[PDB]
Amino acid sequence: TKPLWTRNPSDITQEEYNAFYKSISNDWEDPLYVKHFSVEGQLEFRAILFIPKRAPFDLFKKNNIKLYVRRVFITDEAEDLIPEWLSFVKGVVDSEDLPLNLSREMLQQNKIMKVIRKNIVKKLIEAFNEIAEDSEQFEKFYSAFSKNIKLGVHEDTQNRAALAKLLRYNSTKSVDELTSLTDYVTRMPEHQKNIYYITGESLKAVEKSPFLDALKAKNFEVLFLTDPIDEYAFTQLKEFEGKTLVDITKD
């Protein structure tokens, strides 16, 4: 039997992926999205990663991804192969090189390993973008992993910006539909040089904040950030597409 992840993703059917996913996830639903890719050149390896439709049970074992080296399974609990904020992904990674028998750290800090981690992260972001093109599929994604996308902004200095494109919020100009930062900017008149936002413990709380009246007076949109980890993401991002992020309750 020839390992599925090695066939060309255009010669594989959805009926097939679904199947493979179920055998490694015990899930009852079909994966939300499949990203099957191959990398060649100085670095060679293949991967088939899955994005579930729901979040797992626990609020917040990591033995998801199966690490194969030249088609030889090694461990289902590979440490440092995928960043923790991406722990929800399922699948298998097969690497051509990468030495064998690594004494703790040489397995969790290996140069080859570090390179593969960044490609997967880059790849999933590409994947996340594709999903965002499918409104219906996206809402399902964001209602399940918006938090993860936020944790991703917290720590990945290299990808921080890309992921920020996946964030969605309720603004003073968008009460019945979360809006993205991209749309926000588009709605920005030329003299407005700052993306405004306010944080609060709940939506109800911030809608009636006495700070909004002056922004509304300049007809400046204001983002509502109501999750505890939202503010740190914004201070970690600093700016978005060249525009500064500014809490309307500070300097």
Binding site: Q42, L43, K111, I112, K114, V115, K118, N119, T157, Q158, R160, A161, K193, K238, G242
Partner: protein
């Protein structure tokens, strides 16, 4: 008999390439120029596996920038700055690079600095970075 670290050579190449790049030509009211390369961390090894000699280099680079912009009225007010690029790697695309622009002692009157940096100095660093890899293998990448 092949593994040749180059963290050393790259440190020289960028210092010799970055320092001096400018957003303007000193005269303009809005001007910026890189003062120096404060940090170059990461790895820049060049391995030789098969007819192909390679390098899976991933560098984090930071630099300091001098400049002055359009003041409230006449003469231009100065500013200190730094720019951090978390990743310049072997598989980077001209657009892959990220530029965290920071302004020291920044005032609402130093607004036009960043814009000046983003549209005038960045596309230069992007092309400078795109070339690194080549000039790297072109050297420590042949007998």
């Amino acid at each position: 008999w092949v593994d040749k670290n180059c963290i050393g050579w790259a440190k020289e190449y960028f210092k010799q390439k970055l320092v001096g790049v400018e957003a303007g030509s000193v005269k303009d009211k809005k001007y910026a120029k890189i003062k120096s390369v404060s940090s170059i961390e990461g790895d820049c090894e060049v391995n030789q596996r098969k007819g192909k000699v390679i390098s899976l280099f991933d560098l984090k680079i930071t630099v300091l920038i001098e400049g002055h912009v359009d003041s409230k009225d006449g003469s231009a007010l100065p500013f200190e700055g730094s720019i951090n690029v978390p990743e310049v790697a072997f598989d980077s695309e001209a657009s892959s690079y990220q530029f965290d622009i920071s302004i020291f002692k920044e005032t609402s009157e130093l607004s036009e600095a960043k814009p000046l940096i983003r549209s005038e100095l960045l596309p230069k660093l992007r092309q400078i970075f795109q070339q690194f890899g080549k000039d790297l293998l072109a050297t420590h990448g042949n007998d």
